[PDB]
Amino acid sequence: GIRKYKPTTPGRRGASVSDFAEITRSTPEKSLVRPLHGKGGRNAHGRITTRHKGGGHKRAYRVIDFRRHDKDGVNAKVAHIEYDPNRTANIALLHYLDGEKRYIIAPQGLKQGDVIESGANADIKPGNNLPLRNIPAGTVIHAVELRPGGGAKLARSAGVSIQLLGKEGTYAALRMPSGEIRRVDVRCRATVGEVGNAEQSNINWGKAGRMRWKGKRPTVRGVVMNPVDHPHGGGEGKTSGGRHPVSPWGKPEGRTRKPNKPSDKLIVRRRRTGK
RNA sequence: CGCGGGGUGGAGCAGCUCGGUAGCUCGCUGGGCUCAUAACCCAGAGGUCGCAGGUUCGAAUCCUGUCCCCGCUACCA
RNA sequence: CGCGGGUAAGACCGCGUGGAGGCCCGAACCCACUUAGGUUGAAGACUGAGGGGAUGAGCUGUGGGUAGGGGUGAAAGGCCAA
RNA sequence: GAGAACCUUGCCCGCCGAAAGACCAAGGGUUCCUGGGCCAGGCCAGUCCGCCCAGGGUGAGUCGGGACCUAAGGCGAGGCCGACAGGCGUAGUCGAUGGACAACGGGUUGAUAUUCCCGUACCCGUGUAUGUGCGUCCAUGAUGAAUCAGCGGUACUAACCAUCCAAAACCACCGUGACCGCACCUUUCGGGGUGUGGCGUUGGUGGGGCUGCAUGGGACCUUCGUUGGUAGUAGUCAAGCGAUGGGGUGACGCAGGAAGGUAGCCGUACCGGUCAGUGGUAAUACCGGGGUAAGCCUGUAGGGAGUCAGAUAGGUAAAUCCGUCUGGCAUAUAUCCUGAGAGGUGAUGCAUAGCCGAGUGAGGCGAAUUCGGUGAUCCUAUGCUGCCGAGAAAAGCCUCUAGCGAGGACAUACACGGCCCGUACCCCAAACCAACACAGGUGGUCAGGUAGAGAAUACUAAGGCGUACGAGUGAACUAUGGUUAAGGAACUCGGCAAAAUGCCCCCGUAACUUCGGGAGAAGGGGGACCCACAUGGCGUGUAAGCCUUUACGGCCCAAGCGUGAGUGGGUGGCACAAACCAGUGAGAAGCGACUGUUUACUAAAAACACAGGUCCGUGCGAAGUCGCAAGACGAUGUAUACGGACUGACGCCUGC
RNA sequence: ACUAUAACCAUCCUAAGGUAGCGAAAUUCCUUGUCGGGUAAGUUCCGACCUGCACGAAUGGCGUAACGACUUCUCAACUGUCUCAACCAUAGACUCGGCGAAAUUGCACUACGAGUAAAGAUGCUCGUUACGCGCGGCAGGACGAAAAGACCCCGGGACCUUCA
RNA sequence: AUGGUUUGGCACCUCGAUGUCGGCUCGUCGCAUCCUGGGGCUGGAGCAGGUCCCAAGGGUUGGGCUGUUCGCCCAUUAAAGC
RNA sequence: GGUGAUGGCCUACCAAGGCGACGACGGGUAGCCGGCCUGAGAGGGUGACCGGCCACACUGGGACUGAGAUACGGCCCAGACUCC
RNA sequence: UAAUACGUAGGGUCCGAGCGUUGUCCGGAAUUACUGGGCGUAAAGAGCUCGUAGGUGGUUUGUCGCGUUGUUCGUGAAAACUCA
RNA sequence: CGCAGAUAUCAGGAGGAACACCGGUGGCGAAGGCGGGUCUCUGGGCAGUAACUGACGCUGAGGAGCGAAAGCGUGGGGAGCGAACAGGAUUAGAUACCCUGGUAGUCCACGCCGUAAACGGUGGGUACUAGGUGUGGGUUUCCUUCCUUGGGAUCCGUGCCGUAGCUAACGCAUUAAGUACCCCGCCUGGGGAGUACGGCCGCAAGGCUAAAACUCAAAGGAAUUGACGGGGGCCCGCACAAGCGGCGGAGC
RNA sequence: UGUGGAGGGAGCCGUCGAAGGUGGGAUCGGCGAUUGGGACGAAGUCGUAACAAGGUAGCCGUACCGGAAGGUGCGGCUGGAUC
RNA sequence: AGGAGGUAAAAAUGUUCA
C-alpha cells in the first residue's frame, strides 16, 4: 500500500512512500545481480540523447527471467519478494525444484510459498507462465512476448495487465494497458495475473531531491529558453511559445509512429484519446 | 515634434454615384382582438449625413474646408 | 515499537523508547546578500566587517566523457582555458 | 665584516598555535647539504638568501606504484557500417581515484631513512640435508556390474468385450421433375387453379436386425523390468597436485546512536632536583620525569553461524562443491568463527628526566616508571539497529570435480634469491596554479592545555615565525578601529552603515495554521565568590566482602578520583552569560509555495527548478535524440513506463 | 412616482462577446482618482469603491500556513544616520635616508575681466593685476586623462524571428 | 518692447567622448526685493494694508509624501524671495 | 507556629490528591429574611416604612487600643478631590 | 357633509377631595399547565438504533423503619396576616 | 445524423449499467433501504418444546454507530441517462417546459458528508377495551374426501372496514390518535431566523448548537357555503359547424 | 557604682504587602470608510414562480445554472388533479 | 360485460376605497 508521510518538513508535507509490505527481504540474491552504471542520458558519442537523466542512486540489475521457456513442468516456489530499483514492480525470487534460482515480476496476490508452474499443462494461476494457446480468453495476463522466444515485452510495469480477448487462429487478440488491441502469435508466452505494486502510481514524491535520487534531472521549459535554444523561446515577459507547440527540435505535436510498419497489420485498434 | 476617422426616418442599422435617397427592425399614429397590453391590419405617416464645389444636368453617393462622438497619437534617446 | 488508559475490538489519548528530516542554530567546507576599502589594486574581480547554506537537489579529490552552429546549460544567450 | 636596522649568537618582547605547527599527494625539479661568492636578482642595503659557482646528496622483498585485479572510460584483432577520409564495436588489452598483498620500535649523517645500522618479526620463492610420512608397481581392501532362463507388464496384432456412429438397409408418412384417373372454378374459349390414388422419393420425417467406422478395458508373440551364477572377473577407486571450467566468498548504501575499549590528556605513588637576591616560603612549596612498538602467545567484551544423512542433475561436461527437496538430531552461558582490547612476551634490550667533565660538540653514567580519573570525531565495526533512494567489478581466497599423477605432502635445520620506478627538498607555499619572493587559490593526514557545547573564540604549550624598505612626526585629508553630552531616524531614495539583541537554566508565550508549525514568538526572573546541607547525591571503582560454571568470571563496594544541580546563609563590586564569543524583535501587504539554482567579472530576484497537475506522443532494436549509415542512449526499461509541451505545493475553481 | 443610475428593452455585428473571482492592481494614462485608516503633516503603505486607458481563470484566476540575504509600509528598542560635530590611536599622507615607476606629453617665462573668435580663449583685442623659485593642500578650468561615443544617424556585419 | 529662465525653431563648436535629473557640500553674481530700511499716492481715521518708487548690506527655518525639481501639507518665522 | 477557639489559618516536609454534567471554574445581576402586593390556591413578583442579620463609612490596604472594632463623627500609609 | 367613537354644548354616568394618565408587578393567561396544557394535519416525535449516567420496577416471605404516617417536646423572635 | 453509404436488416465482437416476466395493498430489515443466478460468510425474527437462569427488565440525557439521493477526495471505469453547457424550436422575451446533443455525475474500490415530505408528517415498552374481512409465516385440531390452501383454535405479522371511546374536525379505532403506567425528545404567536455572533464538526459544500433588536394583530388547522379552474361528467342556446345575407372599405 | 547587666525602644535589614509601573493576552461594548441582508411603505419598474392539472403538479434534501421570481438533474413525499 | 394507449404546443397582467 502507501505510507503518507507526516508534514514535519515542507519537503515531506504531502509526500508518500510505499509500505514495502509484500517485500520480505532487503537484500538481493547475489548470483543474479549484475552491475549497472548510469549513463546520464548519454550515448556512445557521449552526447545527451535523452534529456533529464543523471545523478541518481547507484543501482544493480536483478536478472529477471522474461523468457520462461526452459523450466516447463519444473515447478518453483516463491522464496522471496524483493525490491527492484530498475522497475516499478517488485520481483519474486523463485526456487525451482531443480535448484535453479530466478527472478520474476512479482504479480499481484503472490506471496512466499506460492507454487509457480510453467508450461502448457500449468494451472491458470497468478505467476504461472504459459503459452497463449493454453491460456483461455478473458484472462488477465502480464509479461507477454511479442514474438516466440523474444522474451516478455508487454505488461511489465506495476499494477498493469493485459486482457486476452480471443484466439481465432495462430493469433491471439490482446487488449493492452493503453487500450490498444493487437494480435500476437499464440506461441508467445504470458505470465498469468496482473503485476503488483499497483499502489506505485499514487506515490507523491514530495520533493525534488527524491526524483534526483531516482535519476530525473530538472526539466526546463522552452518558453523561458532563448529562441536559439528552443522554438518557444524568447519574448519580453512570459510567453506561451509564440507559435504552436513543438519539441526543442521543432517537431510539432502529432503522430510519430512510422506508417507502413510491419506491426500495422497485427494492430487492430490504436488506443483512444479524449473519450 | 506630428499623424488619424463614421455619420442616413424618433432609436439602431443597411444602401456608392446607369440621372433621386432611401429601405429593414424597433418606435409612433389610426383601426381591430380583449372588460383593458403584447400578437394582427394597415389609407399607414415619418429624414436634405449641414453648408461649399463637381465634368455636375444632377448628385446621400464624387472632391475638397466644414460635416465631427471616431479606433489608432506612439518621438522611443 | 512498548507500556498504560479506553474499547466489545477499536479509532483515539497520555507516557516513554526511537532518532526521521532537501528540519533548526552554528565551525570547517561551499557560496557570495549588503556595506566600506581597493579601483596605474596586495589582486586582470579581491580584502575587511557582517551575511546564506552547512546530511544534502550537499561539498570535494582522482580519473574519464560530451567540441563549435556543436557541446553543456535547475535556462542567465550563461559557460566551453582571464 | 671594507661596509650591518636587516646576517650570526645570546637575552628580552611580541605573533600563530584546527596554525602562520608537523607529514603527504598533485605540481615543481635540485630549489636540499657543505664550502665559497656578492656589480645581476631580493621592491632599500646585504657579510645573508629559495640568487651565482663547485662538489656532494635520494639506498626499500614489507612504504607509494609496476610485475596482481578490475570500474568509468579509452585503444580495439577479426568484424559491421561508411563514396574515400573514417564511425562504432566484439574478443581482448589497458585504465585507480578502489580491491588484494608481508614490518615494526629505536639510533645515526651535513644532507637519506618503515629504505642504512641495531633489535625483533613477517611474506614470497629456491636448493641441500634430516625426520615423520602416505602412495603407487607387490599386497590390501570398498567394491559394484553385461549373458541366459523362471516370473510381472509392453499386448506385435490373431483377434475378445463394452460404448458411440450409420455404408446400405424393411415399413408408413409430407407433398410430388413431369405424367397417368376422379372431382370443382376462372379472361368469351384459349396458354391456368384445388384435394387426392400410383409413378421418382427432387429431399425430409418416425421404429427396426444386420453389417462396416472410431474410442476405451483386457491381452498371445514381440518386448521392458525383478531373481538364478558362471562373473566381489573382466573393471573402477584408495598418495598428491588440481583447473584458464562450476560454485561460494570477495561484494560494498545512507543515517543513527548505545555499549565496551584504547590512544590522548589531567593527576598521583615513586624518582631526581631548585631556592629563581621581593613580605612569606626548606620541603609541608615549586620544577622535571613518572616511557617503550610491530610480531608471537592468549582469545575476553561485542558480533555472527544450526548440524548429520539421503536424494537430485539445475550450475555448457562431471562433481562428494553449490543450489533445491526430503527426513533425523538440536535449541544448547553447546560448538565454531570473528574480534577490539586487557595481561604476558617482545624488552637483562631500547629510550629518558637528570649527573660527569667536555665544550667545536665528542662522548660516558643513568633514578623511579605505581595507582586512579577523564576520554575520543579512533578501534570492535565491511558490526548492530532503522530506512529507502535499495547501494561496483575482477582478481585473490576457499571448494568442487574434469584432468595430471609416480612419486608426493608435511615438519625441522642450514644455506640462498627477492626484480623495476619513486624516495633529496618546498608542498595553504618565497619552491605548485597565479607574469612578481603577488593579501588570491590548492585535496588529504595528525588535532596538546586551560576556559568553553565545540575543530568556535581568548590565552598558551610543543613547534615555528617577527615575511625582507626603514627612522621619525600630535598637520589637513583619507582609511581602519574606539568614545561621546542632550535628543534619538529629525539623516536618508531607503534606518545604508553603525548601534542594539546575543549564552545557560527556570517561567511564559498571540493571531493564524496544511495541526507539523508560528516559537528561541513575544515578554520576563536568576547567574559571581565563600561557607554550610555535604564524610552528602551521581559516576567510576580499588581494598574488603559475597557468589560461581574458576576464569581475561560476576555482584556489591569503604577508600581514592572526578562531578554536578539545588536550598539556606553570608561577602564584594557600578557591573557576576562580567573579557572574547554570542538571535534584534513585532505587525501588515505584494511576489514566489517551500529547501535549492542562476547572469565566473555590475542583476540572487518576483526569474529557473521543484513536487503536484493536464495535454500530446510512444505497442517496443518504441517514440524522441546523436549519427550519412551501422550503432548507441532511451532501457538491460515496456503505457502505474518513456519522451515532449504548458502549468507549478496546498485549498476553491479552471467559464464561452 | 425627486434626481440619479438602470434590474428591463430595442437594434447591429460576432465563432463567441470575459463567467466565477479579482480590481487605481508588480497591470490605472487621466492620477497624488475618491473615501476611510495610520501620521502634526503620508504622490509611498493598508482597507474599500469600480469610471478595468489596457485583470482574468493551467501564457492558470482568487487565496494560502510555513519559508525568503526579495520588494513595500509601520512600530518598539537602539544608536554620531542626523541636529552637529569633537577627541584618541593606528595605516598612509608629511619629514630624513635608500631603491625608484606610471598614465600623459605639439609647444611654453601656460594670469584675470569684458569682449572677439569654429558662436564657452593661458595663448587674439582693450585694459586690470602680477617680484623669481619651491613645499603642503583643494579640485573651478585646461571643453582635463582613459576608451577612433555604446545613445542618434549613415554604411557594413553578425545573430534571432517569420504567413519575406 | 525688455529679458533669454520655459516649450520650441536652427543644427554653428564638440560623436578618435563636452557625463544626465534630483539631492549633498561649497559658494558667487544680478535685482525683476520675501523680510529688514527709506519714501510718494490711497476709496490711508488708527492697527493692518493696497499700489508705485529707491534700496541687493545682511538674513531668507525644520519636517511628512514623492527619485523627484516643482507642488501639497504640517509647525514656525521678521521673512520662509526670484 | 498561630488563635479566644477547631482548621492550610500559616510554615517545612511528606503523599497526590480534591471539585466537576447532581453543572465545577467563569460571566451577569443582586444585600438576605420576617414580611409586602397579587392570586381561589399553588404559585408569581417584590425586599419601601417597621423589625432582625449582614456589609460598608471618600477609594484601597493595614493594624493599634481595648472585654468587644467594617473602629461613620479614631490612628497609619498610599491615591483622587477640596481648602490653608 | 346626514360622526351616539373627533371638537364643543347640553344631558347622563362612574368616582368624589379626589379624579384620570403614565410607569412597575400579579391577575385575568389552563399563555411554561405541580395543582393545571400539549405534540398525525394547528408550534411541537430527534432520521433510526445501540447504550452510559439517571429515572422507573413482575409475584412473594421476613426484617430495617430511610421515605411515609401518627403523637409528643423544643424551635418557628416581635411586628405582620387571621379570629375574638 | 446521412447520401464519404445513414436508417433498416443479418452475423460477429467490445464494454458498461440495470436485472423484464416471477413481483403484489406480498416478504425482510431499527431506519436508510433490499429484487438476475450460484457459492461463501453472516445478522435478525417467528412458532413449538417447555430443559435452563431467575426481574437479569423498560426507557435513555449526553455519547457512539448506522444513515436515501445529491455532493467532496483519491484511484479506476464510463454503455445508457444526464445537472451544467451548446445549438434548434416555442416565446413579446425564454438564461425554461419540447427537440438535438452533451460534461460532471450516476457505476466500482476506499473514505469523507451526515442531511430529506429521512412521512404513518403518529418516539419506545407494557396491559386492557366489540367484531367483521383479506393476506403472509408457523403450530395444532375436527369433518374426513381420510383427496386436501375443507374448516376451526392459537402465536407472530401486514392491510381494508367498522363499534365503544377519543378528536376542532378530518379522521384514529386491538398495527389507537381510545383507556392507563414508565422513560425520553420536542412545543409555547407569525415574521426576523433555524439567520447573525461565538463555538464544534467538515477538504469543501455546508451541517449542529443557537439568539436579539425590530416588526404584525395576526400567522395558522379542519371543515362549510359559494365563485372559479387552460379539472371531469351530462345537457342546452344562431354558440360553433353547414348555409344565406351583411358590417368593417365609398358617399350620405 | 556605672555612662554596668538583663530587658525595652528608636533606627536599619528581611518576608508579606496596597497603590503605581512594565508587558502580553482574555473578555465586554461603542465608532468605522465601505458592505450584507431583514422589516414597512403610496403608486414605481421587470416579469408570473405558487394557489384550480395555476397552464411543465407541487414540495423536501442536495447540486448546478440563471436578471428575478425560478429552471434542471438525482432520490424521495403526497400536503397531487383526471381517468 | 372479456380484453393496447392516447391527445388539448405557448398564450401574461389587472392603480384607488372595495
Side-chain angles (χ1 to χ4, degrees):
Chain A
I2 295 288
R3 185 168 89 254
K4 279 208 83 87
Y5 289 141
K6 284 172 88 83
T8 65
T9 44
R12 196 142 289 209
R13 173 78 57 174
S16 45
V17 67
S18 193
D19 52 6
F20 303 93
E22 63 179 48
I23 278 152
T24 78
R25 200 143 66 92
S26 42
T27 43
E29 193 72 37
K30 163 162 161 186
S31 72
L32 298 161
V33 164
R34 304 287 184 267
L36 282 178
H37 71 278
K39 312 274 171 28
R42 290 156 174 72
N43 69 339
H45 301 165
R47 272 184 203 200
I48 287 152
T49 51
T50 288
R51 321 188 294 170
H52 313 142
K53 295 226 184 291
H57 198 287
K58 191 159 173 188
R59 296 183 185 177
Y61 173 77
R62 280 79 164 152
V63 174
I64 318 296
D65 182 9
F66 289 122
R67 197 161 143 264
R68 295 159 65 184
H69 73 291
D70 52 347
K71 293 281 156 282
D72 275 26
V74 169
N75 285 2
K77 73 171 57 44
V78 182
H80 288 288
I81 286 156
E82 303 177 6
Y83 182 86
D84 198 340
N86 317 123
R87 52 194 70 252
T88 46
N90 296 315
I91 55 175
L93 186 63
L94 320 166
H95 292 353
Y96 285 91
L97 314 185
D98 56 20
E100 190 149 350
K101 289 191 188 189
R102 277 185 186 180
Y103 270 129
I104 66 164
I105 284 282
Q108 191 82 32
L110 201 65
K111 313 179 278 287
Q112 276 176 330
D114 278 8
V115 164
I116 298 303
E117 299 170 8
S118 302
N121 302 330
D123 193 0
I124 308 305
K125 299 217 79 63
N128 293 1
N129 165 272
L130 297 96
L132 300 158
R133 194 195 293 288
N134 311 117
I135 292 165
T139 311
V140 189
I141 51 151
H142 70 97
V144 186
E145 310 189 326
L146 276 168
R147 293 179 95 177
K153 306 285 178 136
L154 319 177
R156 278 161 50 150
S157 160
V160 84
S161 56
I162 277 158
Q163 183 142 27
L164 199 152
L165 303 175
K167 293 129 68 166
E168 43 262 16
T170 193
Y171 281 124
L174 305 172
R175 185 174 279 137
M176 305 281 273
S178 74
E180 173 162 315
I181 298 96
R182 68 171 284 160
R183 301 197 311 287
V184 162
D185 209 334
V186 291
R187 275 98 60 69
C188 287
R189 296 174 86 92
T191 311
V192 168
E194 50 182 16
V195 188
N197 208 24
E199 55 256 39
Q200 181 268 325
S201 60
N202 311 342
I203 291 164
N204 182 307
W205 302 101
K207 50 172 195 145
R210 204 147 160 216
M211 307 314 276
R212 292 300 299 275
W213 310 333
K214 295 186 83 70
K216 268 183 70 151
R217 284 200 83 247
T219 295
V220 173
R221 301 170 285 110
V223 289
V224 296
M225 301 184 184
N226 299 115
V228 70
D229 303 314
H230 203 291
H232 296 187
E236 280 290 295
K238 287 199 209 297
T239 54
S240 190
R243 70 188 264 179
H244 302 95
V246 289
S247 86
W249 312 274
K251 301 277 154 55
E253 294 205 335
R255 309 292 168 75
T256 71
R257 187 181 160 79
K258 268 52 155 171
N260 217 337
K261 266 190 106 178
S263 63
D264 296 306
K265 46 167 166 264
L266 298 157
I267 291 166
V268 174
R269 192 206 287 288
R270 190 183 56 83
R271 60 169 202 285
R272 304 275 64 102
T273 77
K275 297 182 173 65

